[PDB]
Homo-oligomer: A and B are copies of this chain.
Amino acid sequence: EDWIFLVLLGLLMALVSWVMDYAIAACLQAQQWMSRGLNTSILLQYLAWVTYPVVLITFSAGFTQILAPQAVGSGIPEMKTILRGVVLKEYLTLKTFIAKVIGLTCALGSGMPLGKEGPFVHIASMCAALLSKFLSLFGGIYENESRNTEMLAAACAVGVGCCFAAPIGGVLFSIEVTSTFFAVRNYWRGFFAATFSAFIFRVLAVWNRDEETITALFKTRFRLDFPFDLQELPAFAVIGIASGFGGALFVYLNRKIVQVMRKQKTINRFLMRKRLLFPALVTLLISTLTFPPGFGQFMAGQLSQKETLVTLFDNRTWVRQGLVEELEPPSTSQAWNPPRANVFLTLVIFILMKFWMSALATTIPVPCGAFMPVFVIGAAFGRLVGESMAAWFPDGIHTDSSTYRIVPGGYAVVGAAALAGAVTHTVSTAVIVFELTGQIAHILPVMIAVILANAVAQSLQPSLYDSIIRIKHQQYRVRVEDIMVRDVPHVALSCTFRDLRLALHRTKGRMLALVESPESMILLGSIERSQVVALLGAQLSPARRRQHMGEMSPEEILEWEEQQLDEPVNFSDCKIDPAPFQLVERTSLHKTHTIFSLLGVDHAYIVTLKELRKAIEGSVTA
């Protein structure tokens, strides 16, 4: 049951990933062809390069808003809530699936600096849930909510891995971000299905002849014998620490911008009146600023995210390219070398500018991710550091009568992984970059930088997903009993339905306490609403009524039904939930936190969560 479900999930995920990659590649090449074919005049080229991304962003935003507004956003915090016990059923629908897929496809094909990790993991979970209902028609065993949650958790890992074609890093990323306690059984299913999905995706890529064989997406060609020297270790460490700041700073600005979007009343009014104008305006601004013959000469704006990341991982030293540039074809790296600006100046401009472009683009009401822009900007930072170090040591480092030339690509990988970890607070970023590049020779520098960046970022700022979810010994002193109300309705065993209907019209609660006797008061079991509906539906069979012997007003029928309320109730056929939640009134808040973090139950033992959460919010912010 489980294994075939994972296999099918992986197969459909590989198909979806391949078709989305093909669509975004087609959109990108269409954009490049339109830009190049209108080179006769700068004005027409600017007009096309502006209108195209604007058109795609407006179309995606409008389609997502009309079809399913819940598709807006990354969705990773949403599944964090899902796996913490808060079941938002509205997010897992076919309409939201189509809206999110089309919106993410258009956003990624418009050339916007956005990521796919969030919407794609959301689609992973949604597809797993849809396959769960599809298999439910062939058997009720899938109706279990615990197994559905397990499959959703596995599908998160499957989607994150299929994003990078990295089954290990994807599953580790999902474990870090979507949960705090993870079962090794769920790890097994998630990694298995992610492996199958990556296999099928690579086979499809080979079949389409996009890649010659099953290989890495971001191939590097660093030296394996001597990839790095010991004297390179501390600077690499610095690359981490600064990246941590670059992480802690980033999560700051984004959280501010949305607040500026939310707190300002005039901006809110403009959004409520002209919701499609803001994405159009920001896309206009970014397209104008990244115009290749304009400011794009200082940013290499003619490159999309993929080729930019590939170029940043180049193993050659750009600073020394000026002497051996006669016996090779024109490589892509020449786009980073304008005749008027040095490599270092271009890298600094790209960093300082793409930083705030990504910060603003992450706030757009479209399905998009943030891991890709952070990865690209960190790769640029690492490339800058590596080029600076190579400039400081033109002939490399001397060790044991040998001279080893410094490779800026290793520094770029280090910086990308470190800044991704700093922004996200996840350890798998090293695993993801390792599986993307295909070389683990730089394992120690990347790892040290990632650890340092994650540590300093966690010391400074919480994670970006936590920011989204928050925007979208003295503990023993406080007691819970001080806010408990003694007024609770009780139902006698031999009472009539009059008191029951009076309580139903008086109390809007979802549950009632059916006690055995007022003295012992041993509660035997809760009653579900679906149980009552099923009993009512089955009771109206003519056989039982016969054996247990038109413009009319409904009041007469209601009176007859009231007079016919002397029949017994049965609890044999349908299921009964045997597990109330458990706490003690004197439980320490640490154990409370651990238990509620373990599985995420909204209810405890009647006490409600609303006022307790109000008190907690009033005890932490002040």
Contact = CB atoms under 8 A, between A and B. Distances in A.
A318 interface: no
A175 B184 contact: yes
Interface stretch (A125-133, A328-336, A364-372, A579-587): A579-587
Given A206-B230, A440-B440, A444-B198, A182 B185 contact: no
Given A226-B213, A438-B440, A584-B582, A183 B184 contact: no
Given A195-B447, A427-B188, A586 B579 contact: yes
Interface string A59-81: 00000000000000000000000
B431 A192 contact: no
A441 B430 CA distance: 16
B444 A441 contact: no
Contacts of A441: 438
Nearest to A591: B579
B212 A230 contact: no
Nearest to A450: B195
Interface string A407-439: 000000000000000000001001100110011
Interface in A1-47: 3
Given A202-B444, A230-B214, A577 B588 contact: yes
Most buried by B among A180, A439, A440: A440
Nearest to A167: B447
A427 B171 CA distance: 12
A181 B224 contact: no
Given A226-B213, A400-B212, A434-B440, A582 B582 contact: yes
A509 interface: no
Interface in A190-237: 191-192, 195, 198-199, 202-203, 206, 212-215, 221, 224, 226, 228-230
Contacts of A183: 180-181, 594
A430 B440 CA distance: 14
A528 interface: no
A179 interface: yes
Contacts of A451: 191-192, 195
A590 to B, nearest CB: 8
Interface in A241-296: none
Contacts of A83: none
B191 A180 contact: no
A578 interface: yes
Contacts of A434: 440
A448 interface: yes
Contacts of A431: 168
A181 B228 CA distance: 37
A182 B185 CA distance: 12
B588 A195 contact: no
A443 interface: yes
Contacts of A503: none
A164 interface: no
A448 B195 contact: yes
B180 A184 contact: yes
A176 interface: yes
B230 A181 contact: no
Interface string A571-615: 000000111101110111011001000100000000000000000
A187 interface: yes
Contacts of A583: 582
Contacts of A430: 168
Interface in A558-582: 577-580, 582
A232 B214 CA distance: 12
B447 A443 contact: no
A3 B454 CA distance: 13
Nearest to A597: B183
A313 B598 CA distance: 43
A427 B230 contact: no
B180 A214 contact: no
Interface in A425-481: 427, 430-431, 434-435, 438-441, 443-444, 447-448, 451, 454-455
A141 to B, nearest CB: 10
A3 B212 CA distance: 46
Contact of A438 (B176, B224, B591): B224
Given A181-B181, A183-B180, A580 B588 contact: no
Nearest to A207: B230
A587 B578 CA distance: 6
Most buried by B among A184, A214, A427, A438: A184
5 contacts: A176-B187, A180-B184, A181-B181, A195-B447, A434-B440
List 8 A-B pairs, minimum CB-CB distance, nearest first: A582-B582, A578-B586, A579-B584, A579-B587, A181-B181, A195-B447, A579-B586, A180-B184
